[PDB]
Write a protein that binds this ligand. Structure first.
Ligand SMILES: *C[C@@](*)(O)[C@H](CCCNC(N)=[NH2+])NC(=O)[C@@H]1CCCN1C(=O)[C@H](N)Cc1ccccc1
Ligand SMILES: *C[C@@](*)(O)[C@H](CCCNC(N)=[NH2+])NC(=O)[C@@H]1CCCN1C(=O)[C@H](N)Cc1ccccc1
Lengths: 232, 232
């Protein structure tokens, strides 16, 4: 997270830390007692861990629940070339224990676009600068959704890649506020509602006005696949 | 086809006429002795026919081969809302008999974009005016690929819908030349190479400069699915 601040410990109890390996992290949302929604580009191995109720990565906390993946369900329409449908459901070996510290983030009922100018938040343990590594504590930043047509601009992504109807852009006109490396999978919250999944930006330019972070929209199509994959 | 002309009978022997029902037709390409590639939005029923070696729809011709569908393989990533991946493979009950009149159109080796300004052709039995019904004989028109960024313009599709990296636009700056209703599925040929599949335009505005026809690009991703579905 670029230009955010350290969250009140455990004030975002749906946040999942994904320890992928030694060099890599990701985030995600707990969407059911045994389901984590994250991004498809986040590659797990057999040693990977899903950590619930975390604030600090390193510090030992009584609140933490270390979970294991039973099965990966990457979205079958994920296109690594367009970045389209960058979604993945992780089924856990056991159910999380819900409490004050570990909660379920609810899916939106309707898969609406988010209207430009809306204020949104994203939390994560990723880079806080375009250098170095992850943040030891969970941080959060507030961002504005940027009009899709501006996002596809010559002064923005400029069709490399195309920012389509199942993505939103969010940041600031002036820059300084963004997700970054290691925030992939993190839920985009907009006016209290789960709305997107952190996907990509410009390499080593988190927070550059040219490259507002791109979030996969929880649209009708993506919701259908989520609901189907869980229930049944 | 808008602003085209009647083809020399049987000079495009890979062309498939799809008789979907009484009110509807489509086109397609014969890509193997028992495989037709068309568009996913083209709905067949049990009475539907795939006609090979046709020139006229009505007239009885010794060249015609009336084929039947064993199984439909609509592209699993087809999105009816974005029009994305509008592709469908039809497996035939028997093999076509290849001759002078019925041939296989070869897939491109590399799934490249088509560069703006390239001249392309599309053939079909669809509307020749923004009214009335199909053409009794196969026609063909030549069109130019329109730059993707112009296609997404305020004076064009204007993000309703987005014209993405797995679509090309083709028509003319002045209008008058286009595919139309009933041409869906027809192969887009560019400098001798099979390049796209006729998908959509603006309703009752075939040939309007605002809405150049949109073709699904035979990109790497789509080729992989085609090859996989056939061989195995
Ligand atoms: C996997 C995630 O941790 C990470 C989050 C980065 C978010 N960045 C900003 N600025 N908010 N995502 C990625 O690293 C993704 C997946 C792999 C590629 N990628 C990118 O962000 C590339 N920079 C995307 C790209 C854009 C334009 C041209 C080439 C590549
Ligand atoms: C199914 C095909 O025969 C047909 C071909 C039309 C090609 N038109 C031009 N101008 N070259 N395609 C369609 O009818 C497709 C599938 C169903 C919807 N559709 C459309 O062409 C709509 N007009 C697409 C559309 C665009 C903008 C807004 C709403 C719908």
């Amino acid at each position: 997270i670029i230009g955010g601040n350290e969250v009140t410990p455990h004030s975002r109890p749906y946040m999942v830390l994904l320890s992928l390996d030694r060099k890599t992290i990701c985030a995600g949302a707990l969407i059911a007692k045994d389901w984590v929604l994250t991004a498809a580009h986040c590659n797990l191995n057999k040693r990977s861990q899903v950590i619930l109720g975390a604030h600090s990565i390193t510090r030992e906390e009584p609140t933490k629940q270390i979970m294991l993946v039973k099965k990966e369900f990457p979205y079958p329409c994920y296109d690594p070339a367009t970045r389209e449908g960058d979604l993945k459901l992780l089924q856990l070996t056991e159910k999380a224990k819900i409490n004050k510290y570990v909660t379920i983030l609810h899916l939106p009922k309707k898969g609406d676009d988010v209207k430009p100018g809306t204020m949104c938040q994203v939390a994560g343990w990723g880079r806080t600068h375009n250098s170095a590594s992850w943040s030891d504590t969970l941080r959060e930043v507030e961002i504005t959704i940027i009009d899709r047509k501006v996002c596809n601009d010559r002064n923005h992504y400029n069709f490399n890649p195309v920012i389509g109807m199942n993505m939103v852009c969010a940041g600031s006109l002036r820059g300084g506020r963004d997700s970054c490396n290691g925030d992939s999978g993190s839920p985009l919250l907009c006016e209290g509602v789960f709305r997107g999944v952190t996907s990509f930006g410009l390499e080593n330019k988190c927070g550059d006005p040219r490259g507002p972070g791109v979030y996969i929209l929880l649209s009708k199509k993506h919701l259908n696949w989520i609901i189907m994959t869980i229930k049944g």
